[PDB]
Each structure stands twice: as C-alpha cells, then as structure tokens.
Amino acid sequence: GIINRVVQLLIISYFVGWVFLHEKAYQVRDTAIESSVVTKVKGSGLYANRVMDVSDYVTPPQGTSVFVIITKMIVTENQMQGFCPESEEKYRCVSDSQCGPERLPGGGILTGRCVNYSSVLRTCEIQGWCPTEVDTVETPIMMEAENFTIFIKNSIRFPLFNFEKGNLLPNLTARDMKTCRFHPDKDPFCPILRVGDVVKFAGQDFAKLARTGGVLGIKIGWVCDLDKAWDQCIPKYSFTRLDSVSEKSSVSPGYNFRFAKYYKMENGSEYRTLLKAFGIRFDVLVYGNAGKFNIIPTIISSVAAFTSVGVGTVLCDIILLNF
Amino acid sequence: GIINRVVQLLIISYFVGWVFLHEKAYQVRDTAIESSVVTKVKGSGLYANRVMDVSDYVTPPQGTSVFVIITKMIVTENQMQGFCPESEEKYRCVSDSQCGPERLPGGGILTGRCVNYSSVLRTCEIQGWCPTEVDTVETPIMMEAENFTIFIKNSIRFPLFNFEKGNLLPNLTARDMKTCRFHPDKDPFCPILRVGDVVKFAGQDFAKLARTGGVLGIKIGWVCDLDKAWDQCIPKYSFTRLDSVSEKSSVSPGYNFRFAKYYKMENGSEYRTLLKAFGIRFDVLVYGNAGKFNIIPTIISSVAAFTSVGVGTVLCDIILLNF
Amino acid sequence: GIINRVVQLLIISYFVGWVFLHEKAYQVRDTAIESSVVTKVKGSGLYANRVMDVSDYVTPPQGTSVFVIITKMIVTENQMQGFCPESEEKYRCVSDSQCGPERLPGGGILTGRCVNYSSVLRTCEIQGWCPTEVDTVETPIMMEAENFTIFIKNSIRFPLFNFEKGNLLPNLTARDMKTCRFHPDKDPFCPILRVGDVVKFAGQDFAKLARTGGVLGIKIGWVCDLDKAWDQCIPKYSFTRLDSVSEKSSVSPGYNFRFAKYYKMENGSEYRTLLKAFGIRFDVLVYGNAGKFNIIPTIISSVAAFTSVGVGTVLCDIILLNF
Numbered sequence: 001g002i003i004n005r006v007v008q009l010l011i012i013s014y015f016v017g018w019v020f021l022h023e024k025a026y027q028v029r030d031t032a033i034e035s036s037v038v039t040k041v042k043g044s045g046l047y048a049n050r051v052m053d054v055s056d057y058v059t060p061p062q063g064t065s066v067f068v069i070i071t072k073m074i075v076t077e078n079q080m081q082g083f084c085p086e087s088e089e090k091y092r093c094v095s096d097s098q099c100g101p102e103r104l105p106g107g108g109i110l111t112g113r114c115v116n117y118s119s120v121l122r123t124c125e126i127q128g129w130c131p132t133e134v135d136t137v138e139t140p141i142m143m144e145a146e147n148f149t150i151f152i153k154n155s156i157r158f159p160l161f162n163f164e165k166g167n168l169l170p171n172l173t174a175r176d177m178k179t180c181r182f183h184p185d186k187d188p189f190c191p192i193l194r195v196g197d198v199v200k201f202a203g204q205d206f207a208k209l210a211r212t213g214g215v216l217g218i219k220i221g222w223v224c225d226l227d228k229a230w231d232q233c234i235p236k237y238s239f240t241r242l243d244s245v246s247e248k249s250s251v252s253p254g255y256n257f258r259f260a261k262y263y264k265m266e267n268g269s270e271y272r273t274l275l276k277a278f279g280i281r282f283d284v285l286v287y288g289n290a291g292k293f294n295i296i297p298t299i300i301s302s303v304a305a306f307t308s309v310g311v312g313t314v315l316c317d318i319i320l321l322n323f
Numbered sequence: 324g325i326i327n328r329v330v331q332l333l334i335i336s337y338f339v340g341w342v343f344l345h346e347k348a349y350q351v352r353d354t355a356i357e358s359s360v361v362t363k364v365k366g367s368g369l370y371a372n373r374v375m376d377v378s379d380y381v382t383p384p385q386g387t388s389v390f391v392i393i394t395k396m397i398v399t400e401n402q403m404q405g406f407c408p409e410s411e412e413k414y415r416c417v418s419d420s421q422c423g424p425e426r427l428p429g430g431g432i433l434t435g436r437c438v439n440y441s442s443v444l445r446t447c448e449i450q451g452w453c454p455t456e457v458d459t460v461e462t463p464i465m466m467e468a469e470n471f472t473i474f475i476k477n478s479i480r481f482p483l484f485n486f487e488k489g490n491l492l493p494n495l496t497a498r499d500m501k502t503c504r505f506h507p508d509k510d511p512f513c514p515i516l517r518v519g520d521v522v523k524f525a526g527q528d529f530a531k532l533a534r535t536g537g538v539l540g541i542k543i544g545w546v547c548d549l550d551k552a553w554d555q556c557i558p559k560y561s562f563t564r565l566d567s568v569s570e571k572s573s574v575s576p577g578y579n580f581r582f583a584k585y586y587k588m589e590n591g592s593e594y595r596t597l598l599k600a601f602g603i604r605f606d607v608l609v610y611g612n613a614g615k616f617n618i619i620p621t622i623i624s625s626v627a628a629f630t631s632v633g634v635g636t637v638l639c640d641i642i643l644l645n646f
Numbered sequence: 647g648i649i650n651r652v653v654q655l656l657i658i659s660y661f662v663g664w665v666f667l668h669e670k671a672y673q674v675r676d677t678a679i680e681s682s683v684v685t686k687v688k689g690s691g692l693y694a695n696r697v698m699d700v701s702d703y704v705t706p707p708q709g710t711s712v713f714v715i716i717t718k719m720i721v722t723e724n725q726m727q728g729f730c731p732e733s734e735e736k737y738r739c740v741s742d743s744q745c746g747p748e749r750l751p752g753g754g755i756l757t758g759r760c761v762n763y764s765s766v767l768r769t770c771e772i773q774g775w776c777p778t779e780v781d782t783v784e785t786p787i788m789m790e791a792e793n794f795t796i797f798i799k800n801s802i803r804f805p806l807f808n809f810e811k812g813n814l815l816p817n818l819t820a821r822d823m824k825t826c827r828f829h830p831d832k833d834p835f836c837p838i839l840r841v842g843d844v845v846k847f848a849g850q851d852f853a854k855l856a857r858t859g860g861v862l863g864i865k866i867g868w869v870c871d872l873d874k875a876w877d878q879c880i881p882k883y884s885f886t887r888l889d890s891v892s893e894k895s896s897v898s899p900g901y902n903f904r905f906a907k908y909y910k911m912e913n914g915s916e917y918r919t920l921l922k923a924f925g926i927r928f929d930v931l932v933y934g935n936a937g938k939f940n941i942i943p944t945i946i947s948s949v950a951a952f953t954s955v956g957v958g959t960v961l962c963d964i965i966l967l968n969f
C-alpha cells in the first residue's frame with residue numbers, strides 16, 4: 001500500500017525533477033555551434049647556433065586551429081639530383097643482387113648497383129637527391145620552445161539565440177595581454193597559453209615530447225545556459241595528447257615529417273635543403289551547446305510530465321490491485 | 324464537455340499534423356552527409372607595382388575548403404642572421420639593464436645590450452633575422468582583390484539513399500561558367516563567387532576587412548526531401564564573418580600571419596624575405612540531411628500516433644470524469 | 647481473440663527484442679569519439695627524368711589527415727615580372743580593342759595592347775609573370791606513384807569509458823610493418839596502405855585519376871561494443887571518391903592547383919618556377935561510437951519496456967472489447 005506512494009514519489013521526482021529540471025527540458029537547445037579559431041605563436045629559440053622565429057619553426061604558417069611547433073630537426077644541406085649510396089645500415093649491400101625490389105623505400109630509386117658508402121660499410125646505390133640523409137647521432141631539441149606562447153582567438157556563436165561570445169572579452173586591454181596568466185579554472189579568458197603549460201596540462205614531459213614529436217589537443221567547450229548571465233557563459237579548457245598510440249608503440253613513437261627548401265644557382269641547377277622535422281602539433285577543438293527558456297518546450301515538456309506521472313500511477317495502481 | 328472534443332482536436336492535430344506530417348515522421352533520415360569541396364581562385368592584382376596572381380596571394384595553395392586571399396603585406400626584404408636593434412618603439416632602451424626578460428617577444432633573442440636604432444631613438448639589441456620588421460606607416464591593400472573569383476566544386480552524397488548531387492549540375496557548360504551570375508536564391512548552381520560579393524553577403528566592407536584581415540564563412544546546406552524531385556535538392560548558401568570577436572575587440576582587430584621566402588647566395592649564406600600577410604580567410608562549411616519515405620517508420624510512426632491520441636483522450640476523459 | 651495474443655507477441659518482441667536487445671538499450675553510448683591521425687608517404691618516382699621523393703610530390707607536408715600526392719605537372723620554369731602575350735588560343739586577338747574586360751582571367755593584368763605570340767597566332771598582352779603557361783600537349787603522369795605507400799597512425803579514444811585503441815596494435819613489430827598486407831577485412835591493423843590499393847578500393851582507375859586529379863576518402867569507423875572483448879574493437883575501412891561531381895562533369899573533371907617555387911638571383915631580381923599540380927588528395931575521415939553496459943539505462947530501459955508492453959496490451963484489449 002505504501003509502495004504506491006513510494007512509486008508516486010519516484011515518478012514525480014524522476015519526471016519532474018531529473019527529466020524536467022536537471023535535464024532542462026524547459027529549454028530550447030542549440031547544438032549547431034558556429035566556431036572560428038585563429039592562432040599566432042611567439043617566441044625565439046637557438047638551434048644549430050641559429051636563431052629561429054615563428055617563420056622558422058611554425059608550420060603551416062596561416063594561423064589555423066592546427067599548427068606544428070618544430071622542436072627538433074635533421075637537416076640535409078645542399079642536396080642535388082644524382083647518384084649516391086644509401087646512408088643507413090638498413091641498406092647494407094655486399095652483392096649487387098641484394099639491391100632489389102625487396103628493399104625498403106629509400107632516398108631515391110635503386111640503380112641495382114652496389115657502392116661503398118664508407119671504407120667500413122657498403123650499401124645500395126640510388127638515383128635521387130644526394131647525399132642521402134644520415135641518422136647516426138641524435139639531434140638536440142629547441143629547449144626555448146618550452147616558453148613559446150600560443151595566442152588563441154576563438155569566436156563562437158549560437159545562431160538560434162543570436163548569441164556571440166569569445167575567449168577575448170570586450171574589455172580586454174593591452175596590459176591584460178601583456179600580463180594575464182592563463183588557467184583553465186582561474187583565468188579562462190587569457191588569450192596567451194604557454195606552450196610548456198599546454199604540454200603539462202596534457203600530461204606530457206616537454207623534453208620527451210619535443211624529442212619524439214607528438215600531437216596535443218586543446219579542447220574548448222562552450223556549454224552555456226543562456227537563461228543565466230552572459231558572464232556565466234565561459235569557455236572550458238581541456239588538454240590531452242591525441243596520438244595516444246605513439247606512447248604505447250615502439251614502431252612509431254612520435255610525430256615527424258619531411259619537407260624541403262628549394263634553391264637554384266645562377267648556373268640554374270637545382271639544389272635543396274632537406275628537413276626532417278620533429279614537433280608538437282596543436283589541434284584546437286571547439287565544441288559547445290546552448291540552452292534558453294522557451295514557452296513551447298515548457299508546455300510540451302510539462303504536459304508530457306503529467307501524462308507520464310499519470311500513466312505511472314495508473315499502471316502501479318493496476319499492478320497493485322491484481323497482486 | 325466540449326473541452327473533451329477540443330483536447331481531441333489538439334491531440335489529433337499535434338500528433339498527426341505537426342509531429343507526423345510537418346516533422347516528416349513517415350521519413351527515414353540520413354544525417355551522415357558525405358561532402359567534398361575543391362576551390363580555385365582566379366584574379367590578378369597590383370601590389371608594390373608588381374602583378375600578383377593566385378600563386379602569389381592564395382595560401383595554402385592546394386585548393387581546400389579553407390584558404391586565404393592575401394590583401395595586405397608588410398614585406399621585409401633580405402633578412403640575414405645577425406645582430407640588430409629592435410625597430411618598434413615598444414622596445415625603447417636607454418640602459419642595458421632595461422633589456423631583460425620582462426621585454427615582450429621580438430624579432431630575435433635579446434643580447435642584453437642596448438643599441439641606437441636611429442639618432443632620435445635607442446632600442447634593445449637582438450640576435451636573429453636582421454633587420455627587424457618596421458611597422459611605422461600603414462601599407463596599402465590590393466584593391467583588385469575585390470574582383471577575384473572563387474570556384475567551388477562541392478560534391479555531396481547521402482549514402483543511405485545512394486544519392487549524389489553537386490553545385491555543378493551535369494548540364495553545366497563552359498558558357499555557363501563564363502557568364503553565370505551567382506545568387507543564393509536566384510542561381511545557386513553557379514560555381515563562381517565574386518570575392519567582393521562573398522564579403523558583402525557576409526555583411527562586411529571589403530576595404531576595412533582587407534585592411535585588418537578576417538575570416539569569412541561560406542556555409543552550404545543540403546537539406547533535401549528525396550521524396551520530392553531531384554531538382555528540388557538544391558544547395559542553400561549562407562555567408563558570415565566567423566571571427567566575430569575581432570570587430571568587438573581593440574587588442575586584436577583582424578587576421579594576419581607571418582611567413583618567409585628563403586633564399587641562398589652562391590656564397591651559400593642564407594637570407595630570407597619576411598612577409599606579414601593580412602588577408603581574408605574563407606571557410607567552406609557543408610552541412611545537410613536527407614529524408615525519404617520508408618514503410619517501416621510509417622508503420623511505427625502511425626502506430627505511435629494512434630496510441631498517443633488514444634492515451635490522450637483516455638487521460639482527458641478520466642480527468643474530466645473526476646472533476 | 648487470438649489477435650490479442652498475436653499483438654502481445656509483437657509488442658513483447660519489438661519492445662524487448664529489437665528495441666531493448668538489438669538496439670542495445672541496456673547500453674550507455676559514447677558518441678564523442680576523440681580521434682587523431684598522422685600520415686607519412688613513402689615512394690620515389692621518375693618525372694621529367696628527375697627522381698621525386700615525398701618532399702617533391704606530397705603536399706602539404708606536415709602529415710595531416712588530408713594530403714595530396716602529385717601525379718602530374720605543368721612546369722613553367724624561370725618566370726619573371728614583365729610583359730608578354732597570353733599563350734592559350736582562348737586569348738586570340740587581332741585588334742587591341744578585343745583586349746578588354748570581357749576577357750577571362752589570365753596570367754596577369756591586361757595592358758590593352760595586342761601582341762604576336764607566334765607567327766601564326768596573335769593574342770592579348772599581359773603584365774605579370776612571364777612567360778605565360780602553355781597547355782598545348784598533355785604531360786605524363788608519374789606511374790610509380792601507384793606503388794607509393796601511405797602510413798596511417800590513427801588513435802581513437804572514447805573518454806566516457808576511458809577507452810583508447812589504435813590501428814597500430816601494441817604488439818606491432820618492425821617485421822609486421824615491413825611485411826603486413828593491408829586488407830579491410832583480412833588485416834585491418836596493417837598501418838601501410840598501397841596508394842594503388844586505396845585507389846582501387848575507391849573504385850577508380852589509377853591511370854585516369856592520376857591524369858585528371860581527384861579526391862579519395864579513407865573512412866575509418868570505430869564502432870565498438872565495449873561489453874565484448876577489447877580485441878573485438880577493430881577499425882572498419884571504407885574507401886570512396888569524394889569529388890563525385892568531377893566524373894559526371896565535363897567543365898571540371900578532376901582536381902589540380904597552382905603553386906610556385908620562388909628564387910632570387912645574386913643580382914637580386916625575383917624569378918619563379920610555376921607549377922600546375924594534378925594529384926590525388928586523400929581525406930582520412932574517422933568516425934565511431936562505443937557502448938558499454940550500465941545499470942541505470944538497464945533499469946530505465948526495462949521499466950519503459952514493461953510500461954510499453956502494458957500500455958499496448960491495455961489498448962489492444964480495449965479496442966477488441968469495443969469492436
């Protein structure tokens with residue numbers, strides 16, 4: 001008998017409490033958030049006893065939500081089209097018959113010939129950009145990169161509610177930019193993020209990450225209850241490492257890529273500087289949903305709540321009557 | 324008593340009208356739209372008394388759904404690694420003690436020394452790419468850019484219905500491409516969009532936007548009722564400015580980025596031309612959903628409609644009987 | 647009378663079978679899959695009797711989920727700023743009055759003058775990068791590209807369940823990478839995909855696609871029932887051509903873009919090599935959802951199932967009683 005009142009309390013609390021209130025059933029929701037992100041990196045570093053600025057270590061440069069900060073390099077200066085022996089011992093050859101299709105991809109095409117790379121070692125010859133890259137001793141990382149700064153201009157708009165807000169508040173001043181200390185909880189509206197800070201929030205050691213290269217995710221969440229104040233609509237920052245496979249795998253431990261700088265002589269012959277770049281890639285991911293009171297969903301939601309509590313009390317009353 | 328018939332009419336109209344008909348409950352919906360976009364920009368401009376073509380002002384060049392049209396530049400010719408004073412007055416120095424870590428990021432690293440940039444002004448010395456960039460007088464914009472054209476090839480497919488359509492209709496001819504006048508309502512299938520037109524549809528003044536740089540969004544919506552004709556499935560174009568924070572903020576008003584062109588002398592020393600690029604970034608955003616009649620959702624939906632009207636009439640009859 | 651039992655069986659089977667079991671209503675679902683992709687292309691080709699490696703034919707180089715493998719080129723060596731006649735016959739001129747605004751976009755700006763490109767043909771003069779590109783005879787494709795390899799490191803994580811898996815299994819070894827043969831069904835965890843294989847899975851002929859250029863989609867789906875074994879969570883590969891409009895359209899049949907290599911003389915004058923690149927663009931699209939048993943959805947789902955079967959039997963009993 002009392003279980004009838006108990007079931008009534010559970011129905012009323014669930015349908016009118018969690019379902020109607022906690023789940024904001026009274027609210028119209030906009031999930032088609034419109035986001036824009038623009039980035040700018042600042043910092044200088046010493047690498048190969050040369051100073052490196054944003055135009056040196058940032059790529060691509062257009063300042064999108066995805067960019068790489070180069071922290072390590074294998075530089076192959078003055079490559080030229082020609083024939084030369086493969087550098088790595090993986091291409092060791094003693095007989096020209098060993099230089100065949102079974103060989104792994106290399107700096108160029110295989111001539112089928114076999115050549116001496118050094119007095120001690122002989123490898124397969126290739127036609128391509130010469131000389132081949134040599135990966136015998138590890139290259140240093142750009143320590144100063146830990147202090148580089150990332151400037152994130154993130155604009156978001158829920159169009160259903162014609163609501164626009166950004167991580168740059170309208171009262172932001174040059175002094176703020178010069179002195180604000182970003183923190184996900186303490187100061188979400190500071191547009192400057194310290195690269196090292198981003199790496200640590202992601203749970204990574206800058207030394208190792210900068211050695212291997214990696215992909216870090218900067219997630220920006222705009223979950224805003226437009227019923228509450230405009231100043232309650234604030235961005236929630238999360239940080240992680242997206243290439244999680246890399247740490248668990250010995251075959252491929254990080255992130256790197258190769259690109260070249262192309263030059264011509266007055267003579268007119270082409271030569272290039274090859275670059276194997278290790279760096280930290282930053283993906284700025286923006287998500288959000290907004291909700292605002294609307295009478296229509298309040299009517300439909302409350303009507304559904306009353307029909308639900310009624311059907312519940314009816315069925316429990318029947319089940320109690322028969323049993 | 325009559326309110327029983329009124330409630331019956333509201334239930335029947337809501338569940339069989341808005342819910343079943345207006346909401347196309349009889350329809351199976353595909354929301355996993357598959358989209359592809361390829362872009363090509365055409366136009367020539369005069370800047371620094373030099374002609375600039377797509378390979379000069381478009382970046383990146385691969386013709387993706389996101390690209391920048393450079394409209395303004397600060398060009399720093401023939402930079403070389405070395406030591407030089409900072410150009411901007413923000414780095415004004417009178418004592419070498421002022422050249423410290425508190426200084427903002429600059430062209431290079433700080434030597435701690437203090438040097439005379441000019442007879443009137445003295446600033447901090449830096450090691451890096453020299454000379455530093457000078458932002459004393461504003462640079463002009465590339466007016467002709469207002470007439471550049473954007474070619475958008477957008478292919479979409481709802482795989483559930485094996486439906487494929489594109490903004491390029493199969494009867495498109497070279498004359499069409501040469502003469503069609505794009506309009507979101509009047510001619511949605513003209514693949515050529517005038518940059519200036521795109522800027523205005525976005526509610527922006529090309530002169531100001533091209534001065535500050537900005538991000539414009541070209542949204543393409545494919546909402547198609549595959550029950551209706553194939554020719555009713557047409558793209559709906561919307562235009563906006565995504566970096567809305569920029570206009571409301573004095574600290575950062577637009578969009579720009581820095582990249583370099585790298586050169587070598589026969590002597591072998593590196594020198595580069597630095598470029599601070601202001602431009603309009605175009606993000607082509609494609610969305611869509613499709614619906615087609617399917618008997619299953621018609622059965623389940625109609626059954627749910629009858630159970631709903633029945634439960635409604637039952638509950639209203641009970642509430643009327645007791646009260 | 648028997649139709650009452652029939653309706654009871656259909657209600658019980660639908661609500662407790664398809665709705666509760668087949669639809670895994672007992673399961674909590676994570677649809678906010680977190681994905682990261684890194685790519686690396688390997689292979690060498692012969693083009694213009696020059697060897698081409700990843701730094702030559704891959705763009706952009708940063709190894710993102712979207713990259714192009716250049717398979718065809720129109721190379722315009724040593725362009726210089728100046729005046730020259732337009733190359734293509736589309737710009738044929740006999741009178742300087744024909745060189746006007748009605749002309750289509752060209753290599754540069756129009757001087758309004760008319761010049762002889764050859765003894766047989768006269769075209770409009772332009773100021774810009776000279777000479778203009780000549781598209782009279784088709785250029786070959788890089789056949790070897792069919793054998794290039796794409797290395798895909800895809801990391802995925804359902805955070806709700808703190809579940810992380812990747813196409814690189816933790817027991818992956820160098821021998822595996824050297825010898826595994828990718829197949830969507832037979833070996834989903836081989837990280838090396840043969841470009842030609844990808845083209846064929848997409849239903850395309852490499853010769854034609856490489857002639858015209860195109861966009862191929864590599865879709866990776868992680869639909870995992872975390873109730874089952876970890877080793878049951880495997881990636882499902884799908885392949886397609888995203889620029890489907892291209893094959894149905896004569897005006898634009900493929901995908902190409904133009905970029906330049908910029909050079910300076912010791913004299914200091916600029917000259918560039920223009921490149922019209924035809925290639926295959928690969929878009930790696932990752933999707934997924936995960937589900938794991940949770941008691942809460944089991945309680946709510948089973949309660950809803952009993953209320954549903956009860957309401958069904960009640961309404962069918964009433965409809966049978968009255969009729």
Ligand SMILES: CSc1nc(N)c2ncn([C@@H]3O[C@H](COP(=O)(O)OP(=O)(O)OP(=O)(O)O)[C@@H](O)[C@H]3O)c2n1
Nearest residue numbers: 104251252253254256686687688795796797823824838
């Ligand atoms: C044997 S066929 C093939 N095709 C690829 N596209 C490809 N991309 C990467 N790999 C190989 O897969 C391994 C992991 O790649 P990785 O994380 O880039 O390490 P890594 O920097 O030593 O790769 P590389 O220096 O050899 O370019 C590595 O041994 C690399 O050589 C690839 N192998």
Ligand SMILES: CSc1nc(N)c2ncn([C@@H]3O[C@H](COP(=O)(O)OP(=O)(O)OP(=O)(O)O)[C@@H](O)[C@H]3O)c2n1
Nearest residue numbers: 040041042149150151177178192427574575576577579
């Ligand atoms: C003080 S630490 C820091 N780190 C950044 N990554 C960064 N990126 C941009 N800023 C600064 O934030 C301001 C807004 O950036 P902006 O919209 O790019 O304007 P701007 O073109 O004058 O920026 P810059 O010329 O200084 O590169 C501006 O004063 C710029 O100097 C940045 N400041």
Ligand SMILES: CSc1nc(N)c2ncn([C@@H]3O[C@H](COP(=O)(O)OP(=O)(O)OP(=O)(O)O)[C@@H](O)[C@H]3O)c2n1
Nearest residue numbers: 363364365472473474500501515750897898899900902
């Ligand atoms: C007449 S205004 C205009 N503006 C564009 N941005 C634009 N982009 C491409 N087109 C034209 O539209 C046609 C299809 O473009 P496409 O697939 O790139 O073929 P294509 O390689 O011969 O294009 P182009 O060599 O002329 O650059 C083609 O004739 C091309 O010239 C464009 N036309």
Ligand SMILES: *[C@@H]1O[C@H](CO)[C@@H](O)[C@H](O)[C@H]1NC(C)=O
Nearest residue numbers: 143144145146147148424425
């Ligand atoms: C970062 O900069 C601070 C000064 O603001 C300096 O004390 C510190 O050593 C720097 N860190 C690195 C890794 O260079």
Ligand SMILES: *[C@@H]1O[C@H](CO)[C@@H](O)[C@H](O)[C@H]1NC(C)=O
Nearest residue numbers: 169170171172229230231232
């Ligand atoms: C700037 O405006 C925001 C808007 O809510 C407010 O929270 C903040 O206190 C303001 N800062 C200053 C310095 O007025």
Ligand SMILES: *[C@@H]1O[C@H](CO)[C@@H](O)[C@H](O)[C@H]1NC(C)=O
Nearest residue numbers: 080082265266267268269270
């Ligand atoms: C350019 O110079 C190099 C060495 O100085 C020489 O090998 C090459 O043949 C020259 N180019 C041409 C086209 O002769």
Ligand SMILES: *[C@@H]1O[C@H](CO)[C@@H](O)[C@H](O)[C@H]1NC(C)=O
Nearest residue numbers: 466467468469470471747748
């Ligand atoms: C755009 O081109 C038209 C000719 O089609 C010309 O009349 C107009 O002045 C041009 N606009 C600009 C800003 O150059």
Ligand SMILES: *[C@@H]1O[C@H](CO)[C@@H](O)[C@H](O)[C@H]1NC(C)=O
Nearest residue numbers: 492493494495552553554555
């Ligand atoms: C091209 O086909 C579309 C398909 O609906 C049609 O609307 C249009 O009128 C056709 N144009 C011509 C010139 O036939």
Ligand SMILES: *[C@@H]1O[C@H](CO)[C@@H](O)[C@H](O)[C@H]1NC(C)=O
Nearest residue numbers: 403405588589590591592593
């Ligand atoms: C290259 O020339 C410049 C000036 O002509 C000179 O400063 C530099 O030392 C030269 N390079 C080398 C390696 O000497």
Ligand SMILES: *[C@@H]1O[C@H](CO)[C@@H](O)[C@H](O)[C@H]1NC(C)=O
Nearest residue numbers: 101102789790791792793794
């Ligand atoms: C691809 O490589 C194989 C050797 O593994 C060779 O037999 C075949 O001819 C190559 N295909 C092309 C198109 O070069």
Ligand SMILES: *[C@@H]1O[C@H](CO)[C@@H](O)[C@H](O)[C@H]1NC(C)=O
Nearest residue numbers: 815816817818875876877878
């Ligand atoms: C590697 O681990 C996976 C995990 O399920 C397993 O299926 C596979 O058989 C393992 N391979 C080897 C060689 O142990």
Ligand SMILES: *[C@@H]1O[C@H](CO)[C@@H](O)[C@H](O)[C@H]1NC(C)=O
Nearest residue numbers: 726728911912913914915916
């Ligand atoms: C550079 O040389 C070319 C031809 O050798 C000449 O036309 C040009 O005027 C030179 N540059 C300058 C600034 O004189």
Ligand code: NA
Nearest residue numbers: 088090133135
């Ligand atoms: Na290697």
Ligand code: NA
Nearest residue numbers: 411413456458
């Ligand atoms: Na500045």
Ligand code: NA
Nearest residue numbers: 734736779781
């Ligand atoms: Na053409």
